């Protein structure tokens, strides 16, 4: 996350962190329930083997609320393509259930129509993660969150060098220096409604980070709600 | 209806028979007034944790 703020205690409880064999975080995830984590399919090409960590806010020190979970099943979207970044979604079934507690809780899955009419219509959504805090910098040590404005689909399409498919949407700023960045991929984009947070996107990609005239690109969760439901039923 | 202040629903709003019908995410149950959503246990989805 470039710009934005540190997630304060209890503020981003649905944040999951995928970690590699060397225990380093390489991508984000969103807790959907005790057994399922939502992440980006492209993250799965990033590590030989990986585990999921929940409840972590500072990778510099075990605080007590953290918990590592091994993955039992990786359900990647059949139609995902590394070439266009289309269908950038994957569901992880954990071997053991997550125990909810302070800093560990699921984000709600909305219904498609209501989500499209009322959530993606909101002024902003919230993205969060342990990724880079500058386009060329190193991974963040502290979990951060950033409020990102929903971006008109047409200006979004015009701003991008690559095709914005119907499975993607835009958020962020034209010139202001704030945006998700490398390491945040697979992480949560949620929208608040009457103090309840609903999952609306998955951190996907962008051209550099926080670049002038460019926005952050997110997988459009509302387009895979049936696919998610199926993935969690198995 | 649902375009007027989300139909007074706490969460999901659907316009059926020209009438507003409210509903809730998993882990919540529709209140007696048929509009509010009541968490069914601790750590309901979408709530920031206070303890
Ligand atoms: N902003 C960000 N926000 C969120 C997550 C991000 C993850 C990685 C990077 C880092 N990355 C990943 C690749 C991208 N480089 S590009 O602009 O050449 C692109 C080439 C291309 N070809 C086909 C489809 C799309 C593209 S984008 C970049 O900057 C930037 C991110
Ligand atoms: Ca820690």
Task: State the CATH class of domain A13-106+223-234.
Answer: mainly beta
CATH of range A1-12+107-222; options 2.40.10.10, 1.10.357.10, 3.90.79.10, 1.10.1040.10: 2.40.10.10
- Count of the separate structural domains present in chain B: 1
Q: Which of A179, A176, A174, A181 minimizes the C-alpha distance to A159?
A: A174
Q: Which residues of A30-63 are buried (b: 16+ CB within 10 A; e: fewer)?
A: bbbbebbbbbbbbbbeebeebbbbbbbbebeeee
Q: What is the four-CA torsion angle of A174, A175, A177, A178, rounded to 10 degrees? A: -10
Experimental method: X-ray
Query: Same CATH fold, A13-106+223-234 and A1-12+107-222?
Result: yes
SS (H, E, C) B28-47: EEECCCCCCEEECCCCCCCC
Residue whose CA lies nearest to ligand 1 atom number 17: A207
Catalytic one among A86, A140, A179, A185? A185
Residues less than 5 Å from ion ligand 2, measured at CB: A 56, 58, 63
**Which neighbouring-strand residues pair with A43?**
none
Neighbours of A13 (CB within 10 A): 26
Report the distance separating Cα A8 and Cα A145, nearest Å.
9
Question: Which CATH number does the domain housing residue B20 bear?
Answer: 2.10.25.10
Its domain, for residue B32, covers 1-51
CB contact under 8 A, A108 and B46: yes
Domain range summary for chain A, segments of one domain joined by +: 1-12+107-222, 13-106+223-234
Residues 1 through 51 of chain B touching chain A, CB cutoff 8 Å: 2-3, 6, 10-14, 23, 25-27, 37, 42-51
Report phi then psi at A75, rounded to 5. Answer: -110, 100
Asked if residue A200 lies in contact with residue A189, where contact means CB atoms within 8 angstroms, the answer is yes
Q: Say which residues have a Cβ less than 8 Å from residue A151's Cβ, sequence separation at least 6.
A: A169, A170, A171, A172, A215
């Amino acid at each position: 996350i470039v710009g934005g703020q540190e997630c304060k205690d209890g503020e981003c409880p649905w944040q999951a962190l995928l970690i590699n064999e060397e225990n380093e975080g390489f991508c984000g995830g969103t807790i959907l329930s005790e057994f399922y984590i939502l992440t980006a399919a492209h993250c799965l090409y990033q590590a030989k083997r990986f585990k999921v960590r929940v409840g972590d806010r500072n990778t510099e020190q075990e605080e007590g609320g953290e918990a590592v979970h091994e993955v039992e099943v990786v359900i990647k979207h059949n139609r995902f393509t590394k070439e266009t970044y289309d269908f950038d979604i994957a569901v992880l079934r954990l071997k053991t259930p997550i125990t909810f507690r302070m800093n560990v809780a699921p984000a709600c899955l909305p219904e498609r129509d209501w989500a499209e009419s009322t959530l993606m219509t909101q002024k902003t959504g919230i993205v969060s993660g342990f990724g880079r805090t500058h386009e060329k910098g190193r991974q963040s040590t502290r979990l951060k969150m950033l409020e990102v404005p929903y971006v008109d689909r047409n200006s979004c399409k015009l701003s991008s060098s690559f095709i914005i498919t119907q499975n993607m949407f835009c958020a962020g700023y034209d010139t202001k220096q704030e945006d998700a960045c490398q390491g945040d991929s697979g992480g949560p984009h949620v929208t608040r409604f009457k103090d309840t947070y609903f999952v609306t996107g998955i951190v996907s990609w962008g051209e550099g980070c926080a670049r002038k005239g460019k926005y952050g690109i997110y997988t459009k969760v509302t387009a895979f709600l049936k696919w998610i439901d199926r993935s969690m039923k198995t | 209806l649902c375009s007027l202040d989300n139909g007074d629903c706490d969460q999901f709003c659907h316009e059926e028979q020209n009438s507003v019908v409210c509903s809730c995410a998993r882990g919540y149950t529709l209140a007696d007034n048929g509009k509010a959503c009541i968490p069914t246990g601790p750590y309901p989805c979408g709530k920031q944790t206070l303890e």
